[PDB]
Design an enzyme around this catalytic site. Structure first.
Site, short mmCIF file in Angstrom:
data_model
loop_
_atom_site.label_atom_id
_atom_site.label_comp_id
_atom_site.label_asym_id
_atom_site.label_seq_id
_atom_site.Cartn_x
_atom_site.Cartn_y
_atom_site.Cartn_z
N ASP A 223 41.90 46.60 37.89
CA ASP A 223 40.60 46.50 37.28
C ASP A 223 39.82 47.43 37.68
O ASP A 223 40.34 48.77 37.69
CB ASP A 223 40.06 45.10 37.65
N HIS A 251 40.37 50.20 35.10
CA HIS A 251 39.51 50.07 34.04
C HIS A 251 38.57 51.04 33.98
O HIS A 251 37.59 50.76 33.20
CB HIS A 251 39.10 48.54 33.97
#
Length: 376
Positions: A223, A251
């Protein structure tokens, strides 16, 4: 930029030296940490093995941890070992706060974690206690729409001038490093490596904290590589320097989704390869607030699908919170491969104004703009 003068950390001298064997090390390490002179560190060296197997540890104020080259401090693959209540850890439910972190520093001043050894969370290892690994709980949590209870690697709360230096952090069950409600955090030569498919594995996240420096580090995870957050009813997040870094999978170099007062963020010299999002500012109606004075410069991206993302309606959540995002600049930013730039200012009273100087995207790239004006 961080308001402090920040220069490369120096590793503390050891107070005590421990040698790894095949036994559980939790209480041996904790005992050493509890009798360590101010300004020194408990040193983790090799013995019959090079692995210290432990459960939750508490880092006292002014005390540090030092992990030798080739040595690993590894989190036991047992859910009950990290619980803070009967059966609260390694499950999916309405909690999310059921597990203690591996290393926790509460109300510390001048505390730190030094390598160049490794801290391994064993995120992908079947627990002794359950049928699945920590990462396998995310699918269940996502599909069921609930929260998984898994341990963070390093949790730092209400602390001052904490140092993370020359160390590797791998396979974190949850976020790797969290710096909450504090002032003064420096991560330098920090390596983070966790598989790109492991959900809920943010790299380094300042939360309602000020004076942060992340430099000369390498972050590749599932993430957010970095997620800068600020919460309602807590301190503003201000003065951050993200300099001379390399980001891999993940991310992005993000701000949000909690954006209740994020100020003076300086990002310079950032190389990105394979990150799904590049530079991101995101929120929703439940947590949008003021984001002011964000400057990105000398960013080079390769194989990044969404190089620039400014989204005020990332997810659809209920709330009346309005984003007040301003003084956002991008300078000398290049994206070498085909990607999409998303600029969405829905729910902002007026169009979000952004400045883009020398931003070079490939000719086949697309811009999706809604209620945001780009000045060149």
């Amino acid at each position: 930029s961080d308001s402090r003068t920040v220069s490369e950390p120096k590793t503390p001298s050891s107070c005590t030296t421990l040698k790894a064997d095949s036994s559980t090390a939790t209480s041996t390490i904790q005992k050493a940490l509890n009798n360590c002179d101010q300004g020194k560190a408990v040193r983790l060296s090799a013995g019959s093995t090079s692995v210290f197997l432990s459960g939750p540890l508490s880092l006292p104020s002014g005390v540090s941890l030092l992990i030798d080259k080739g040595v690993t401090l590894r989190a036991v693959n047992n859910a009950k070992s990290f619980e803070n209540a009967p059966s609260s850890c390694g499950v999916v439910d309405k909690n999310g706060k059921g597990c203690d972190a591996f290393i926790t520093a509460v109300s510390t001043t001048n505390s730190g974690i030094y390598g160049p050894g490794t801290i391994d969370g064993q995120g992908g290892v079947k627990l002794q206690d359950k049928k699945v690994s920590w990462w396998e709980l995310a699918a269940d949590a996502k599909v069921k729409k609930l929260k998984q209870n898994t341990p963070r690697l390093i949790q730092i709360n209400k602390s001052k001038n904490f140092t993370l230096y020359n160390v590797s952090l791998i396979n974190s069950p949850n976020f790797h490093v969290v710096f909450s409600d504090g002032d003064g955090f420096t991560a330098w030569k920090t390596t983070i490596k966790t598989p790109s498919t492991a959900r809920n594995t943010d790299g380094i996240d300042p939360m309602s904290s000020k004076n942060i420096t992340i430099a000369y580090s390498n972050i590749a995870t599932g993430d957010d590589n970095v997620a800068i957050k600020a919460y309602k009813g807590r301190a503003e997040t201000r003065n951050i320097s993200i300099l001379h870094n390399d980001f891999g999978t993940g991310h992005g170099m993000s701000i949000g989704s909690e954006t209740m007062g994020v100020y003076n963020v300086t990002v310079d010299d950032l190389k990105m390869n394979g990150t799904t999002n590049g530079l991101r500012i995101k929120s929703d109606k439940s947590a949008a607030g003021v984001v002011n004075g964000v400057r990105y410069s000398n960013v080079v991206m390769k194989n990044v699908a969404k190089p620039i993302v400014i989204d005020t309606v990332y997810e659809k959540k209920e709330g009346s919170n309005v984003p007040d995002w301003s003084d956002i600049t991008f300078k000398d930013v290049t994206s070498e491969t085909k990607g999409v730039v998303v600029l969405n200012g829905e729910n902002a009273k007026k169009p979000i104004e952004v400045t883009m100087k020398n931003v070079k995207l490939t000719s086949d790239s697309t811009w999706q703009i809604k209620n945001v004006n780009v000045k060149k």
